[PDB]
């Protein structure tokens, strides 16, 4: 939640999600379904999945099942700051992490 250092989320790094697009409709529906209320609305969205992490995820979960899930960034440990998530891909501690 502290975006690594004091850095603004720019556009040359991790991309922006446009307003009233079909990604601004997909993130509304899958989140409003989990909370079951319409009083949840999004004001900013970003895209984190680099093609390095997409290819690594596809090779690992070949034949598995894929679930969409949310994780709170403030409750996330400080080493999984948003700058490091754009590099490594949300490293798992040896004690595991829930979803």
Partner 1 sequence: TYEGLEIAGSPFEVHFIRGKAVAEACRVIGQGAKTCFASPSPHLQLPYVNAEEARALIDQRAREEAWKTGVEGKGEPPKPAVLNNYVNQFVVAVCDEMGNRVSIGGHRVSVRGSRGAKILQVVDEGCGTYRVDYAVYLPKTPLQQIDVGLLEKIDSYAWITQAQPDVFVPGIAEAYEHIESLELPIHTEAEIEVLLNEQPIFGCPFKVRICNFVEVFNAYAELDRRSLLGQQVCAFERVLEEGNYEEATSMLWKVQDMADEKQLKEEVVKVLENLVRKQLEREDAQKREAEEGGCTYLLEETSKDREEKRRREVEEIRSQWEDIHLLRELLLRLNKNCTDR
Partner 2 sequence: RVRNRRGEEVADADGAVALCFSPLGEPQYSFVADPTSSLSVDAYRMDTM
| Measured distance CA(23)–CA(46) in Å, rounded | 10
Q: Per CB under 8 A, does 47 bind partner 1?
A: no
Q: Which stretch binds partner 1 (CB under 8 A): 29-37, 53-61, 64-72, 84-92?
A: 84-92
8 lies in the site for partner 1, by CB under 8 A: yes
**Partner from partner 2, partner 1, none contacting 52, C-beta within 5 to 8 A by type:** none
Name residues whose C-beta falls within 8 Å of residue 99's C-beta, 6 or more positions apart in sequence.
Answer: 67, 69, 71
Give ∠ CA 81-18-43 in degrees, rounded to 5: 60
Among 33, 43, 65, 66, binds partner 1 (CB under 8 A): 43
């Amino acid at each position: 939640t502290s975006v690594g250092g004091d850095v603004r989320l720019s556009e040359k790094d991790l991309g922006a999600v446009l307003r009233d697009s079909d990604e601004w409709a997909f993130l509304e529906y899958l989140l409003q379904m989990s909370v079951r209320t319409s009083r949840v609305r999004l004001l900013q969205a970003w895209h984190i999945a680099t093609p390095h992490l997409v290819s690594a995820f596809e090779r690992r979960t070949q034949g598995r099942l894929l679930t969409y899930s949310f994780v709170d960034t403030a409750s996330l440990d400080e080493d999984n700051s948003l700058q490091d998530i754009a590099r490594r891909g949300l490293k798992i501690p040896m004690t595991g992490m829930r979803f």
